[PDB]
Amino acid sequence: PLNQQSLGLLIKERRKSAALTQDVAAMLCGVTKKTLIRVEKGEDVYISTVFKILDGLGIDIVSA
Amino acid sequence: LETIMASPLNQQSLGLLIKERRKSAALTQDVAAMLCGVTKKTLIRVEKGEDVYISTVFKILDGLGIDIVSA
């Protein structure tokens, strides 16, 4: 089960697996690089931002 | 709810998931909010799919025993 930190790590791993820099990923997800960095580090942001990033990187989350 | 869980979550269906889980546990919004350590207003916002900080959502998911995972 995900928490705020492991969600960030998931996003980071998915981004790296897709061979995307933070700049390109940020551009693709429609957020600033700073914001993506915040999210990957597990720092607090609005849920909408997280969904923008999950959507942009093609990461699906579901109920266990 | 069986449609929600059968798909990847978005901001709205997450709220609906929370709502249905709360209802299945026979909890009012007041009691659930108390259990999750948030105000009723905040829980209502989350159930309606309105924007809040992710930490709040995790507080609510934890309090209601809802686990989310990567698909």
Curated annotation (Swiss-Prot), chain A:
Transmembrane segments: none annotated. Induction: Expressed in late-exponential phase; part of the hipBA operon. Residues 11-64 form the HTH cro/C1-type domain. Disruption phenotype: Essential; a single hipB deletion cannot be made, probably due to toxicity of HipA. GO terms for molecular function: DNA binding. The keyword Transcription regulation applies. Residues 22-41 bind DNA. Keywords: DNA-binding, Repressor, Toxin-antitoxin system, Transcription, Transcription regulation. The keyword S-adenosyl-L-methionine does not apply. Homodimer, binds DNA. Forms a HipA(2)HipB(2)-DNA complex with cognate toxin HipA; has higher affinity for the latter when HipB is prebound to DNA and HipA is phosphorylated. Belongs to the HipB antitoxin family. Antitoxin component of a type II toxin-antitoxin (TA) system. Neutralizes the toxic effect of cognate toxin HipA; overexpression in wild-type or a hipAB deletion temporarily inhibits cell growth. Binds operator DNA; in the ternary phosphoserine-HipA-HipB-DNA complex the DNA is bent about 125 degrees. This is Antitoxin HipB. The gene is hipB.
